[PDB]
Antibody, heavy 217, light 214 residues
Framework: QVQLVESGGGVVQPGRSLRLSCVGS????????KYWVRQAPGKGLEWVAAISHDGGEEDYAESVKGRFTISRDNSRETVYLEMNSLRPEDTAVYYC???????????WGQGALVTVSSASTKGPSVFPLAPSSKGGTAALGCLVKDYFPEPVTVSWNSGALTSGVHTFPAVLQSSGLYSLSSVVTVPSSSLGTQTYICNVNHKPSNTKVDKKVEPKS | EIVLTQSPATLSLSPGARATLSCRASQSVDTYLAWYQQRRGQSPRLLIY???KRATGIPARFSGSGSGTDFTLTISSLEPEDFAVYYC??????????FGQGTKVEINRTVAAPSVFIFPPSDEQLKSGTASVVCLLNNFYPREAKVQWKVDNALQSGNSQESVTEQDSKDSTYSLSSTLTLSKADYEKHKVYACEVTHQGLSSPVTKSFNRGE
């Protein structure tokens, strides 16, 4: 089967460089052009770079020309993207792709995530979203604030509570740190007797927090 | 030189129903048009190329048509995985590949008003000099919703951020969190914190509030 496998993603500081790699298998790598297409968080697809079958021709998007270099090594069935002078707006998932005729992106890799930021790794503070305790439905949650980089995971009661949970996408603050909330709806009659604990894990910082959330005095 | 426009940007349709998506090119691209599907959390895949040809292995429910500037993608019966984002694509002048901005196909359902909850900052957070006030809009449909923050009746603009979940796998609703950020010093200068929500399911806006300290 046609397969493309990317590697080399990560967190990089603005102005620095990163090289992405994409290895093909299951087809004749040298026959056709190769491409990189990226998707910034929450945005659409943007073609970045193209290289002809034998590397004799390279094309780039205007946003990326001069700073990025596409290259290939057909003897290793690999195509590369060398990303220099990285800018915050280069943060995206980068997909490698291959073509049959040059018109279209017939096959796609799995993506490599590139995050461009001057923020330092930092685990979150976890604050309670305490239930009001005032249909008999209450809401409670955890505010997972000021962490970098993504991702964080949140469970409730160590996985024993899944119904009614909503863990929201993180927002990026102007500080460069992320914040997100995780909430759950539960019966208000349970608030005095049932313990609710959010389990937060931020693996990049080796930060794990279990926060019990209860009605405030 | 060539712009692809996908409109409408969101289609709300029922499971098992027919869908037709539109791509319009600003000038003719003849039949050199492709469509991609991006399923939730997955890479894009090619569905249709040369306007009407199905890529190898693609299910027979996908079809396409058009020539010149007006193109369509048809899904004869929407399967669960087809609630996805679809992009059209063209290539001009041999060296420029461009995409439309995408159309999201979402699950249509009956209108549901949000249940609304407001959360004060915790005392623990206030120790560090910042206050986060959170408003939750739970399990609503359709997606369009407006949150307005007020602090002692002063409308807040510019100092909040919102996030929305993907459509729920069981009830096809959305939920939304809005966080108002203030300094501790400012938080302690005011009494009434309110989140006002406007939604098609509400006959009039709903406000949830608290009085600091009470």
């Amino acid at each position: 089967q046609v397969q493309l496998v990317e590697s080399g993603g990560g967190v990089v500081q603005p102005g620095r460089s990163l090289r992405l790699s994409c290895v093909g298998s299951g087809f004749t790598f040298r026959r056709d052009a190769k491409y990189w297409v990226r998707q910034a968080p929450g945005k659409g697809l943007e073609w970045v770079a193209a290289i002809s079958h034998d590397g004799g021709e390279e094309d780039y998007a205007e946003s990326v020309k001069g700073r990025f270099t596409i290259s290939r090594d057909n003897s290793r069935e690999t195509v590369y993207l060398e990303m220099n002078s990285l800018r915050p707006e280069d943060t995206a998932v980068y997909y490698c792709a291959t073509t049959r005729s040059g018109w279209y992106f017939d096959y796609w890799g799995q993506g490599a995530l590139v995050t461009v930021s001057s923020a330092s790794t930092k685990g979150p503070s976890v604050f309670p979203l305490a239930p009001s305790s005032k249909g008999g439905t209450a809401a409670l949650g955890c505010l997972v604030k000021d962490y970098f980089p993504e991702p964080v995971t949140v469970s409730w009661n160590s996985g024993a509570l899944t119904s009614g949970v909503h863990t929201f996408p993180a927002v990026l603050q102007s500080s460069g740190l992320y914040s997100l909330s995780s909430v759950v709806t539960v019966p208000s009659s349970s608030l005095g007797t049932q313990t609710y604990i959010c389990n937060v894990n931020h693996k990049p910082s080796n930060t794990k927090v279990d926060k019990k959330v209860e009605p405030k005095s | 030189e060539i712009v692809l426009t996908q409109s409408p940007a969101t289609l709300s349709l029922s499971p098992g129903a027919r869908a037709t998506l539109s791509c319009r090119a600003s000038q003719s691209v003849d039949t050199y048009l492709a469509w991609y599907q991006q399923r939730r959390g997955q890479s894009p895949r090619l569905l249709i190329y040369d306007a009407s040809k199905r890529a190898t292995g693609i299910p027979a429910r996908f079809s396409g048509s058009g020539s010149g500037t007006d193109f369509t993608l048809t899904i004869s019966s929407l399967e669960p995985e087809d609630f996805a984002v679809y992009y059209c694509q063209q290539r001009n002048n041999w060296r420029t590949w461009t995409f439309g901005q995408g159309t999201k196909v979402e699950i249509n359902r009956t209108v549901a008003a949000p249940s609304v909850f407001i959360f004060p900052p915790s005392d623990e957070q206030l120790k560090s000099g910042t206050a986060s006030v959170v408003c939750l809009l739970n399990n609503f449909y359709p997606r369009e919703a407006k949150v307005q923050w007020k602090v002692d009746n002063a409308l807040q603009s510019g100092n909040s951020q919102e996030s929305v979940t993907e459509q729920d796998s069981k009830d096809s609703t959305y939920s939304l969190s809005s966080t108002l950020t203030l300094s501790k010093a400012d938080y302690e200068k005011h009494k009434v914190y309110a989140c006002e929500v406007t939604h098609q399911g509400l006959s009039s806006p709903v406000t949830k509030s608290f009085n600091r300290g009470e």
